[PDB]
Amino acid sequence: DEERLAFYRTLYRDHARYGAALWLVAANMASYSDVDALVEWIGTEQTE
Amino acid sequence: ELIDLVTAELGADWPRLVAPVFDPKKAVVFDDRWASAREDLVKLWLTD
Amino acid sequence: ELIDLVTAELGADWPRLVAPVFDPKKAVVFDDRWASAREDLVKLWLTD
């Protein structure tokens, strides 16, 4: 949401350096469906 | 029968504790450093 | 939705692995020793 989005954005703009990138996803860590979808997302690409 | 089976075995709030959250359209990328670098160059001039 | 939720999280055969078996009408009591004692007295005479 808005609070956490502002938090992670200020975290990046404070502590970032050379070629650093931060990706941010919403995933429940108590669901095997979410763990499988998360590893598929980190695996194959996403082209919208 | 199935829902009070799950209520007796696991818990009453099991589907909301286990419900999937992940969706690949909501991923957020934070890889802008040159722009925040230029703005930080400005506010270094503004600070005394 | 709920059954394939349970299929993705726990397993396909979860209700038959977890299904209740107990029923108090099917309890079996084995407290007869005097009768089997008398029959064993007989078969001690039958054995040589």
Coordinates of C-alpha atoms in Angstrom, one line a residue, chain A residues 1-41:
Chain A
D1 CA 0.0 0.0 0.0
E2 CA 0.9 3.7 0.1
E3 CA 2.8 3.6 3.5
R4 CA 5.0 0.6 2.5
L5 CA 5.5 2.0 -1.0
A6 CA 6.8 5.2 0.4
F7 CA 9.0 3.3 2.8
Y8 CA 10.6 1.1 0.2
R9 CA 11.1 4.1 -2.2
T10 CA 12.9 6.1 0.5
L11 CA 14.9 3.0 1.4
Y12 CA 16.1 2.7 -2.2
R13 CA 16.9 6.4 -2.6
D14 CA 18.8 6.5 0.6
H15 CA 20.9 3.4 0.3
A16 CA 21.2 2.8 -3.4
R17 CA 24.5 2.6 -5.3
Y18 CA 26.2 1.6 -8.4
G19 CA 23.8 -0.4 -10.5
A20 CA 21.4 -1.6 -7.7
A21 CA 17.8 -2.5 -8.4
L22 CA 15.0 -3.3 -6.0
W23 CA 12.0 -5.3 -7.0
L24 CA 9.0 -5.5 -4.7
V25 CA 6.3 -8.1 -4.7
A26 CA 3.3 -8.9 -2.6
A27 CA 3.4 -12.6 -1.8
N28 CA 2.0 -14.7 1.1
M29 CA 4.7 -16.8 2.7
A30 CA 2.2 -19.4 3.8
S31 CA 0.9 -20.6 0.5
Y32 CA 2.5 -23.1 -1.8
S33 CA 0.6 -21.6 -4.7
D34 CA 2.3 -18.3 -4.0
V35 CA 5.7 -19.9 -3.6
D36 CA 5.3 -21.7 -7.0
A37 CA 4.0 -18.6 -8.7
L38 CA 6.9 -16.5 -7.2
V39 CA 9.5 -18.9 -8.4
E40 CA 7.9 -19.0 -11.9
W41 CA 7.9 -15.2 -11.9

